[PDB]
Design a protein around this motif. Structure first.
Motif, mmCIF file in Angstrom:
data_model
loop_
_atom_site.group_PDB
_atom_site.id
_atom_site.type_symbol
_atom_site.label_atom_id
_atom_site.label_comp_id
_atom_site.label_asym_id
_atom_site.label_seq_id
_atom_site.Cartn_x
_atom_site.Cartn_y
_atom_site.Cartn_z
ATOM 1 N N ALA A 149 0.855 -1.212 0.000
ATOM 2 C CA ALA A 149 0.000 0.000 0.000
ATOM 3 C C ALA A 149 0.879 1.245 0.000
ATOM 4 O O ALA A 149 0.668 2.189 -0.795
ATOM 5 N N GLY A 150 1.908 1.237 0.850
ATOM 6 C CA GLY A 150 2.945 2.258 0.775
ATOM 7 C C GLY A 150 3.578 2.432 -0.596
ATOM 8 O O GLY A 150 3.782 3.554 -1.040
ATOM 9 N N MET A 151 3.911 1.328 -1.275
ATOM 10 C CA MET A 151 4.541 1.400 -2.588
ATOM 11 C C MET A 151 3.608 2.072 -3.608
ATOM 12 O O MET A 151 4.076 2.834 -4.468
ATOM 13 N N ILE A 152 2.316 1.781 -3.495
ATOM 14 C CA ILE A 152 1.293 2.369 -4.375
ATOM 15 C C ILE A 152 1.242 3.885 -4.165
ATOM 16 O O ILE A 152 1.255 4.661 -5.140
ATOM 17 N N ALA A 153 1.223 4.309 -2.907
ATOM 18 C CA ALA A 153 1.254 5.742 -2.596
ATOM 19 C C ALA A 153 2.496 6.438 -3.170
ATOM 20 O O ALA A 153 2.401 7.516 -3.755
ATOM 21 N N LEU A 154 3.665 5.826 -2.988
ATOM 22 C CA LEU A 154 4.921 6.454 -3.355
ATOM 23 C C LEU A 154 5.270 6.330 -4.825
ATOM 24 O O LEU A 154 5.887 7.234 -5.390
ATOM 25 N N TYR A 155 4.919 5.204 -5.443
ATOM 26 C CA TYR A 155 5.462 4.907 -6.770
ATOM 27 C C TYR A 155 4.381 4.716 -7.828
ATOM 28 O O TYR A 155 4.685 4.684 -9.018
ATOM 29 N N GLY A 156 3.139 4.553 -7.398
ATOM 30 C CA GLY A 156 2.059 4.218 -8.313
ATOM 31 C C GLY A 156 1.982 2.719 -8.564
ATOM 32 O O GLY A 156 2.906 1.971 -8.220
ATOM 33 N N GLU A 157 0.891 2.301 -9.195
ATOM 34 C CA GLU A 157 0.590 0.887 -9.411
ATOM 35 C C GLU A 157 1.509 0.143 -10.384
ATOM 36 O O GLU A 157 1.743 -1.047 -10.200
ATOM 37 N N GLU A 158 2.024 0.826 -11.405
ATOM 38 C CA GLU A 158 2.810 0.162 -12.453
ATOM 39 C C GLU A 158 4.205 -0.245 -12.002
ATOM 40 O O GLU A 158 4.682 -1.335 -12.353
ATOM 41 N N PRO A 287 9.791 6.356 4.737
ATOM 42 C CA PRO A 287 9.133 7.357 3.886
ATOM 43 C C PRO A 287 8.137 8.228 4.660
ATOM 44 O O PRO A 287 7.560 7.786 5.647
ATOM 45 N N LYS A 288 7.970 9.469 4.208
ATOM 46 C CA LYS A 288 6.989 10.375 4.765
ATOM 47 C C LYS A 288 5.660 10.088 4.076
ATOM 48 O O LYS A 288 5.498 10.397 2.894
ATOM 49 N N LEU A 289 4.732 9.482 4.809
ATOM 50 C CA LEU A 289 3.371 9.240 4.324
ATOM 51 C C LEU A 289 2.351 9.505 5.410
ATOM 52 O O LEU A 289 2.675 9.509 6.592
ATOM 53 N N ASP A 290 1.107 9.705 5.009
ATOM 54 C CA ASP A 290 0.028 9.710 5.973
ATOM 55 C C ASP A 290 -0.343 8.264 6.213
ATOM 56 O O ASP A 290 -0.925 7.617 5.344
ATOM 57 N N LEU A 291 0.000 7.765 7.394
ATOM 58 C CA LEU A 291 -0.249 6.370 7.718
ATOM 59 C C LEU A 291 -1.734 6.065 7.893
ATOM 60 O O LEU A 291 -2.148 4.901 7.747
ATOM 61 N N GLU A 292 -2.524 7.103 8.175
ATOM 62 C CA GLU A 292 -3.989 6.985 8.278
ATOM 63 C C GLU A 292 -4.670 6.754 6.928
ATOM 64 O O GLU A 292 -5.838 6.373 6.900
ATOM 65 N N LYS A 293 -3.953 6.995 5.826
ATOM 66 C CA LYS A 293 -4.553 7.022 4.490
ATOM 67 C C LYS A 293 -3.808 6.172 3.443
ATOM 68 O O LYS A 293 -3.843 6.465 2.244
ATOM 69 N N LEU A 294 -3.115 5.118 3.888
ATOM 70 C CA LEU A 294 -2.460 4.197 2.944
ATOM 71 C C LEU A 294 -3.509 3.515 2.056
ATOM 72 O O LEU A 294 -4.575 3.145 2.542
#
Ligand SMILES: [Fe+3]
Ligand SMILES: [Fe+3]
Lengths: 309, 308
Positions: A149-158, A287-294
């Motif tokens: 889920a983190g990877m999707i946020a940071l890098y996109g699905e592809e 990584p800096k992410l919103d962990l509430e919104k993965l």
């Protein structure tokens, strides 16, 4: 005086703490043990007679879900000043521990200096070091799915897909648990796998030799995984519940998390295992992410879609 | 500055010393050695010693240091904290306890069939066809303490008998307890006498392993007490007393239980749920005078019988 806790954390972790809290305070504590997802369901069908006071979750995402549904009370600065990081934007729950994604490896069979700087480069490293069939992973495991889920946020699905399919081309072995995977590293079935840092801590404490690789700063492979607790709006025991949150952030309870469980604390004043990266250095690598919104449902969809899950 | 002579390992001590320095400002210097070498060093150094505290792996070593006049009496404030094992001399404070136990493969051995006494282990092992499938740790400190407990409880003749009967099981010797428990995991051996915390560590890593206690008062349940004392020579009494107070604090005691796996000695410390509670554990141990354990007699016996 009483207190009711809906816990997405395991009974083996929670019970010793609840018992000490009861002994200390005279407050009777009842816990309902479930999964975060099942608790979220229970919270949306709650009666008014004896509702839960606290939701103690295994994941930031579940607490963010409870918050998004307007089920959680605001918390005060007196409590939220205690954890050193990961206080939610909502300010409707308190982070209690952190668990770090890491790359476990057998240090006798794998050279620390050769390991890749990014999780995305793991398939290339394996392919070029002759490790087809010698990589483990845990597709059904909560934190693995969080990492994706983190990877999707940071890098996109592809890029995430190419990673998932390039990993799948490695003929990786899937394990139903992290201890199973780390036992397989010991056995020689696989040489490395992405895991949570505390599983490595536990194996080391038992005398087994395991390396713990961190990827470059901000890499998806270093995702910080936060546990936390929130006060339910319909709590009929506000003072007792707040007292319990304060207790979870106390030096002694935090030493229990570091000690009995192996997880990172979120307060200072607590002693870490040697050879374990200090708390704040560990936090800098995530990584800096919103962990509430993965994007967890997108990750699960993408894992189910690609036949990894 | 505070100077600790430590018979406890650096792995265990370092995190506590690091935290104590960070919170107090006191610079702490630790000398890591064995209990025996520290006892020798303290005497050799006499009034010249820079040591403030002796933090021992064994209560026996603190017993020796006390009998030899090395230790200062401690205040009631400190000595009222531990729930058990405070010396009559009042010249050191117990800090943790570890229990001898019998570890076993719970798939191959039935809990209800295990012997009530360590003395009957050879009989049991032979009955269950375990010749060559028993482990032990003859060179390990706590095994040697356990043999010393057997001499104290049963006398030399019964202990010699047990040692020879043990030898006739063709047991496998392991240089460390993790190596023995890994052999139990491997199926190389089915059981072995060990310290409780080693089993706790293996279980926490996800392995299934049985933990057997013998009947109340049995030598196989020996309590292995750690502790620390303040040296008469100490010129840093304030810092040393602050450090002992810290070792008995709930947060430090939670470190012993959690990070290390040992039993605490103060009330209010959360243990893993499947572990026998502290006072129950202590109740099963033989009630020996900690400072009287005949370790030298045990080592001589282990050498005569060719175990060492
Ligand atoms: Fe886990
Ligand atoms: Fe040991």
């Amino acid at each position: 005086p009483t207190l009711t806790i809906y816990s997405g954390r395991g009974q083996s972790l929670v019970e010793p703490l609840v018992k000490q809290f009861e002994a200390e305070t005279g407050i009777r504590v009842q816990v309902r043990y479930s999964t975060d997802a099942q608790i979220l369901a229970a919270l949306q069908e709650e009666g008014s007679r004896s509702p839960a006071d606290l939701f103690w979750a295994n994941t930031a995402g579940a607490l963010g879900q409870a918050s998004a549904k307007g089920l959680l009370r605001p918390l005060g600065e007196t409590l939220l000043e205690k954890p050193i990081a990961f206080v939610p934007a909502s300010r409707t729950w308190v982070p209690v521990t952190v668990r770090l994604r890491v790359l476990a490896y057998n240090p006798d069979r794998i050279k620390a200096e050769e390991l890749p700087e990014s999780l995305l480069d793991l398939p290339r490293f394996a392919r070029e070091k002759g490790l087809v069939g010698r990589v483990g992973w845990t597709p059904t495991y909560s934190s693995f799915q969080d990492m994706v889920a983190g990877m999707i946020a940071l890098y996109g699905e592809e890029k995430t897909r190419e990673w998932l399919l390039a990993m799948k081309a490695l003929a990786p072995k899937a394990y139903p648990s992290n201890p199973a995977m780390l036992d397989a590293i010991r056995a020689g079935e696989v040489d490395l796998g992405s895991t949570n840092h505390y599983y490595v801590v536990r194996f080391r404490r038992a005398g087994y030799r395991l390396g713990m690789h961190h990827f470059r700063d901000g890499d998806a492979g270093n995702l910080a995984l936060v546990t936390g607790a929130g006060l339910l709006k319909t709590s009929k025991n506000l003072a007792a519940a707040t007292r319990f949150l304060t207790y979870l952030l106390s030096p002694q309870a935090q030493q229990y998390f570091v000690g009995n469980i192996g997880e990172y604390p979120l307060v200072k004043g607590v002693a870490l295992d040697p050879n374990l990266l200090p708390l704040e250095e560990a936090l800098a690598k995530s990584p800096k992410l919103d962990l509430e919104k993965l994007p967890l449902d997108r990750a699960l969809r993408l894992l189910r879609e690609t036949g990894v899950l």
